[PDB]
A paper describes a structure:
Mimivirus is the prototype of the Mimiviridae family of giant dsDNA viruses. Little is known about the organization of the 1.2 Mb genome inside the membrane-limited nucleoid filling the ~0.5 µm icosahedral capsids. Cryo-electron microscopy, cryo-electron tomography, and proteomics revealed that it is encased into a ~30-nm diameter helical protein shell surprisingly composed of two GMC-type oxidoreductases, which also form the glycosylated fibrils decorating the capsid. The genome is arranged in 5- or 6-start left-handed super-helices, with each DNA-strand lining the central channel.
In the relaxed subcluster Cl3a, the DNA strands at the interface to the ~17-nm-wide central channel are not clearly recognizable, most likely because they are at least partially detached inside the broken expanded fiber. The breaks after relaxation of the helix might be the result of the extraction and purification treatment, while DNA will remain in the central channel, at least in the early phase of Acanthamoeba infection. The transition from Cl1a to Cl3a (5-start helix) corresponds to a rotation of each individual unit (corresponding to a GMC-oxidoreductase dimer) by ~−10° relative to the fiber longitudinal axis and a change in the steepness of the helical rise by ~−11°. The N-terminal chain, being more disordered than the rest of the structure, it is absent in the focused refined map, and also absent in the Cl3a map of the relaxed helix, suggesting that a break of the disulfide bridge could be involved in the observed unwinding process. Density that can be attributed to the FAD cofactor is also present in the Cl2 and Cl3a maps. The atomic models of Cl1a and Cl3a dimers are superimposable with a core root-mean-square deviation (RMSD) of 0.68 Å based on Cα atoms.
Numbering used by the authors:
A (entry chain A), B (entry chain A): 56 to 700
C (entry chain A): 56 to 351
The structure:
Amino acid sequence: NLEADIVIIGAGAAGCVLAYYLTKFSDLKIILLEAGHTHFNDPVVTDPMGFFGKYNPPNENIRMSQNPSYAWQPALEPDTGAYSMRNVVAHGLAVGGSTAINQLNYIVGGRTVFDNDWPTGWKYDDIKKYFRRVLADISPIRDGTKVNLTNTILESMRVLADQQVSSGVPVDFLINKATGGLPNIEQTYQGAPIVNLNDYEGINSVCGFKSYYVGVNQLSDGSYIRKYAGNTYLNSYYVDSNGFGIGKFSNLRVISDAVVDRIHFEGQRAVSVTYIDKKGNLHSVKVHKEVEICSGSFFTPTILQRSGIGDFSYLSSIGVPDLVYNNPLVGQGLRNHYSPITQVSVTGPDAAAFLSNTAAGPTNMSFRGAGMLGYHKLEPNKPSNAGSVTYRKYELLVTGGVAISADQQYLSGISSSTGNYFALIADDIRFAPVGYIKIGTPNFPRDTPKIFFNTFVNYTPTTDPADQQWPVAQKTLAPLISALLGYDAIYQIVQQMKVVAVNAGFNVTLQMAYPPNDLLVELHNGLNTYGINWWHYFVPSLVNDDTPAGKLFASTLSKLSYYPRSGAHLDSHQSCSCSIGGTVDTELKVIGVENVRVTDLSAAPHPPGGNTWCTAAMIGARATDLILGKPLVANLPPEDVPVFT
Amino acid sequence: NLEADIVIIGAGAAGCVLAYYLTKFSDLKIILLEAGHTHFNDPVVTDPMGFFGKYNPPNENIRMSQNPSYAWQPALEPDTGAYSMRNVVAHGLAVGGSTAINQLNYIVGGRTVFDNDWPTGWKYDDIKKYFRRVLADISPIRDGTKVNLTNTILESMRVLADQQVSSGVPVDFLINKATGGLPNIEQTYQGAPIVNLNDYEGINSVCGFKSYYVGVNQLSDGSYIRKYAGNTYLNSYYVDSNGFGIGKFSNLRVISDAVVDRIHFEGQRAVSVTYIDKKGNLHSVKVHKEVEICSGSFFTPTILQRSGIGDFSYLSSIGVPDLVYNNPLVGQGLRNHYSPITQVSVTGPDAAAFLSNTAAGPTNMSFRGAGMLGYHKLEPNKPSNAGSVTYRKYELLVTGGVAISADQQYLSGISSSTGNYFALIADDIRFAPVGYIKIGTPNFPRDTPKIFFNTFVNYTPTTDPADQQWPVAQKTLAPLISALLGYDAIYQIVQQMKVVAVNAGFNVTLQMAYPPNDLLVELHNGLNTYGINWWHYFVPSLVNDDTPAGKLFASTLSKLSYYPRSGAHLDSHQSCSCSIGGTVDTELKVIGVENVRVTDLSAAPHPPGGNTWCTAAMIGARATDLILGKPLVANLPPEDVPVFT
Amino acid sequence: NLEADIVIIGAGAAGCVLAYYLTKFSDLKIILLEAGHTHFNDPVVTDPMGFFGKYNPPNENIRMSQNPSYAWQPALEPDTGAYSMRNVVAHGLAVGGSTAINQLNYIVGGRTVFDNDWPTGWKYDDIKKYFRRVLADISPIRDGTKVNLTNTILESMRVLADQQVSSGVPVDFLINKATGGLPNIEQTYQGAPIVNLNDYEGINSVCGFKSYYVGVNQLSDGSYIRKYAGNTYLNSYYVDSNGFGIGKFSNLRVISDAVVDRIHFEGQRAVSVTYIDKKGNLHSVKVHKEVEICSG
Ligand SMILES: Cc1cc2nc3c(=O)[nH]c(=O)nc-3n(C[C@H](O)[C@H](O)[C@H](O)COP(=O)(O)OP(=O)(O)OC[C@H]3O[C@@H](n4cnc5c(N)ncnc54)[C@H](O)[C@@H]3O)c2cc1C
Ligand SMILES: Cc1cc2nc3c(=O)[nH]c(=O)nc-3n(C[C@H](O)[C@H](O)[C@H](O)COP(=O)(O)OP(=O)(O)OC[C@H]3O[C@@H](n4cnc5c(N)ncnc54)[C@H](O)[C@@H]3O)c2cc1C
Ligand SMILES: Cc1cc2nc3c(=O)[nH]c(=O)nc-3n(C[C@H](O)[C@H](O)[C@H](O)COP(=O)(O)OP(=O)(O)OC[C@H]3O[C@@H](n4cnc5c(N)ncnc54)[C@H](O)[C@@H]3O)c2cc1C
């Protein structure tokens, strides 16, 4: 018999925090049903370079995000906006969840997004303590080596932002209003004082800096290691090697390899939970007080439908045997970030000397900065607070080498064989597309549910007058407009790059190859000759302009639109699957029953401003507080860390 | 308690036959653990047109091979030979298995393949009775409507095969040696006597015909329906609506929704089997005599590793708790068919009249014939019996409309918007690539195991002398050579098509667009000027010819090789996962224990000559005989059908 | 033996409501003798477009009101007033009765007709609660798309009704006296406030509007379905697939395919009822308290 009252389902980035601190300051019984094992000895997972295939045997050079021993492999339905191609994205399969197989970034999400996007009691001032706690527990590290590329970028940014402060435009992309009127770009000289983008009081929404924060820890020996949720919260110091708590944590049980099917359910008080061991046997943990769901964005709603709470007509049509509650918002409104790709060529006598120290390393991992921007001026879909508050919209990145897939490499002909390349990425942060998740089999936890996520749907003109069908075209074309404005943003930095590199004693030439520059200069001409109505030319049938200028600009837009659909990566940064206000209240509690609550990244009512690791950790901390009834994690001193072994 | 001795795992195309006839002529207890439900009322699955989205609501127009309510969705590892892209292929999820979601073809596999490719006791003469039985039980139907396109093709084929009979070449592609020296091409006039490619004594390996055989049955009303393994063997007449046998079949139990985890195992006699109901509860069926595995190519080896029999070092490394037998051939040697794609354009006054009646229908389903060919003359990888026996290598097809993916459509610019197109396909039948399957989680039946399947790997020249590194280049480049020879075959029919269409009173013009003709005429010139050594120019570094002719031919090969990698579909026709001689004997029995046997398409030691439905049905019939001890299905009169309701 | 005391004969539009709510708030034994089966899976009956022959195979394009698998087919005697021609009209044959094969409209019947046409205890004020209940249970839906034809009609109607209000005639056809003297014609512009002809207090006897109320329900997927008495009151949630009640409704039995011949009768207390199963056998349900007739 396996009676319990604390029942966590999944040791993700939020499961570990919740379980660790809940067991630290409470003496209930805790079972953590995890379905993965602890890769404490696997050299590929500990060494960060193993992320880049140092240990793969020659036959099978793949990344852990694809390997089925490491990650769940859902396959999404075809994307009607990207030529009906189906993507595979990964939830982790290990203690610590996705953190075991991630890229280790720590962007906390600025003041603006939570203050004006999150409900009462979750404002930036109400949770920033939790964020301090988690960034303290990890204690990530930066790189401190010089690279002339980042300096070039940041001085070009200063050049351009000085024009932007003048001319009085209130929402241009290099503007910050917490710093008076000017974002604090990091200085450019030996040992300049650093800019920390994750500042405690969220001063910097827009800024420029020079390296990122990754979850490594330099060891005394000289080798760097992965530092993740399983590594910190649940290691040999607290949990027995068989899955039992140690001393102070004695009421803490970890069933490592256990997939939960559903939560058996009585009255409206869920009473029991079923799991399947590796040896094939069902068991049942009895539930006395509560159950916890921390099983990722994708699988959490599936757990809920199989449990019994969800849309009755659909679930009955597929044939789940038990119905509990009719909540037709279960698992709705998924979101994610997106990232197109852009290349540059270099042509000069000493360009090889201009790009040294750009190889990925154990501290940088193929990152060289290099900024974070806001809305472009000519963006039409901005919130009403754009004028008085600055928003985090574009997440600039930079890397050496080639990032485009080998097919695009064949098409453009630009290969890493000819060494003149580096990539700039504008990771959209406020991406619009919204999708939903269902199940197709009421049987067991699969590896692929129904996932619909359509991105770049083009507009179909109708016979309605243009005067009331522009404001549906706008909202349909939103992602295209945002991606194109990001293209403009990257395009209009490269010339300041040319200037500052020529003037810093470097004789090289910079010209974008993918996408080809000529398209972009034509776009710039069209933009600054057509004004805010530049986006009216996505649908040439509505403008009714036969002048060759507008015809050529619309043609340019048309041929350009191929590249965000083709040359991009889909971000793993899923979120927002069981949002507050949709299926749960501000207490994370599930609406319709009394003893089930969801406490993971699915509950976020809005996607945060960065790589969505820290937000889920925060949610775990806060949910610990909510179940506890009193704030202790908020009141713990910042400099107490869990032990590291 | 659920004691049993007949235990079938999976109602595939082979599970249904086995269970139905085993229960017909025997009085044991039979449990059929299936994991799917019976789509007897679903209009999309019954109406064959529903395969082509007549009933899909507008939001979700997808095909059942993608829908997770209908099919398992494994995702293969990236294909290093096709620009590292990952494919998703479908095993069915319903009673009747893949047959529920298939394209309904019935190519039985000729004399040659089984006689010279299958072990003793499985020769063509030893099993052809079973094939007669199954093709009788289905009784498929053909189309009998005229279409001038097929006539054009078949008369061009006659024209060319008359040259091929002369010139004395013994392995050219339009040659048949069972019909003396000449394949029997179907006649071209009103109501000509038909050629049945599935002849009872396998006379026709190579032939030309005019329509295919599909699993429909015209109803009295006027509407056609799907006719499949679940429909025939297990319908309301024999099995209760709760899953119980009727009268004569009273010892027949169907647990519709049950996923098997493993087979609990004692001594070396497997004793028990576990499954998971929809309501989440484990159960256990006790095993008294045998267990049966009919769970498809992909999942069968996975069942075996989770059971305990397989490579010890690997399974121990991932951590399965029980080890039984060390058989490092489990789940090795997967195979499948492949199908590139080719387009044609038409330009003439009455071409629209030349292509009427090519829309897909309830009897044809987008098929218009139109042949089946053998090895091209200049193929270097032929078996030693090529000269004295003719082999089935290329499966010609034809269809109206455009088949290339929308991205290829953008690149070539050829769309179905301009109505001048039809497609010719050369479905390779003796495809070389071989892969293998493993598992990554010893927990439960997932939806995606490790699958490695690499197709178009290019050769990497070394410092070894050419004189002993040509016969590794040959075997590495085999698939490229075969695909290119198929390109030659399709190319050199279109001109006889031009001739016979112009001479049959039709004034139209035919010219291939994808791939572009100019490449192909250059290839033809190079082929007939370079001889059998045309394939030496895949690796220009080895020939050491600087003459511009060879340089241009090698360039043409290089640029052509892009299209089989890009513009093709992967066939769902998996096979050969637990072959005879690898892990089982000629009795299908698993080597190492006494009471487990595999009886599905995974056991085939070689892929058959066609759409691999009939072969698995045959294997089911034969395994019924093997367990029975006496041949009754072979001795049943051919004209007894199971009842249809 | 099939003893009973609640005995409903026919699951029409009135049989379903009666049986459902009678079994909800009472614990007697209920047998519902229906003579039809449940077309829960038949795509033609669920999809409203199937009413207009989307699924008919080419040989037999007919409407369900004619098909004998769906509807009873009485033939009336020749109409001496219409050149002695004989009509065929349909009662439904399914659970839910005629609702299964209908055209899905919801006009409730105004204040006037029941108040001055129906006896004491059935006036509009005495029953309007029940009407609220049923229109609530269905929750029909409207269309919200623009069409210039309806606007043309409604503005012409306004034009003419303005003359009719003047000239003092007290019974002309575009007059309403609950709205003072003028029927409230629906406005004509983008998103004008709608006029609901089935108002709760029966203000509008005469009015103009722009779309009707039909028994569909938009699904999450994008496909509309029939919503009818069998669909609401008697579906898989309450009644077993063999015809037995579920839990709270455990005292509820549905003999799906049973035609009642007569009610065998003793003294002046009817005692028993006979029906004929599909397999041809008579049976007899004993009657303890009452019998119910809801057979059209
Ligand atoms: C390729 C990749 C790159 C990434 N890059 C970054 C990056 O640059 N920066 C960054 O900050 N983050 C990165 N991440 C991490 C990611 O952005 C978040 O850290 C992630 O969303 C963590 O959320 P979570 O822990 O709540 O969810 P998860 O980690 O998905 O939690 C799910 C957990 O529950 C378990 N589980 C699931 N179903 C069951 C079941 N039925 N029974 C029991 N257990 C179950 C799973 O095994 C898993 O451990 C990356 C991740 C990936 C895969
Ligand atoms: C898109 C598509 C197109 C096709 N086109 C053609 C065509 O043109 N011609 C043709 O002849 N055939 C076609 N086929 C069918 C295919 O070629 C064969 O019919 C197929 O290999 C049948 O083999 P099988 O029945 O042995 O395997 P399967 O049908 O895959 O048998 C597996 C069965 O076992 C069940 N099962 C799996 N795991 C478990 C478990 N753990 N517990 C219980 N049950 C389980 C599955 O639900 C399934 O019912 C097509 C199939 C598809 C998907
Ligand atoms: C073609 C058509 C169009 C329609 N259009 C509309 C419309 O636009 N708007 C609208 O509001 N309504 C419409 N209707 C429906 C109709 O106006 C009413 O809904 C109908 O009168 C419902 O009344 P009822 O349920 O009491 O009668 P019925 O539905 O006729 O009740 C009789 C029921 O009892 C069963 N029965 C009969 N005899 C026996 C027996 N001996 N034993 C057992 N069971 C028996 C029958 O099978 C049937 O289920 C339409 C109907 C039809 C046929």
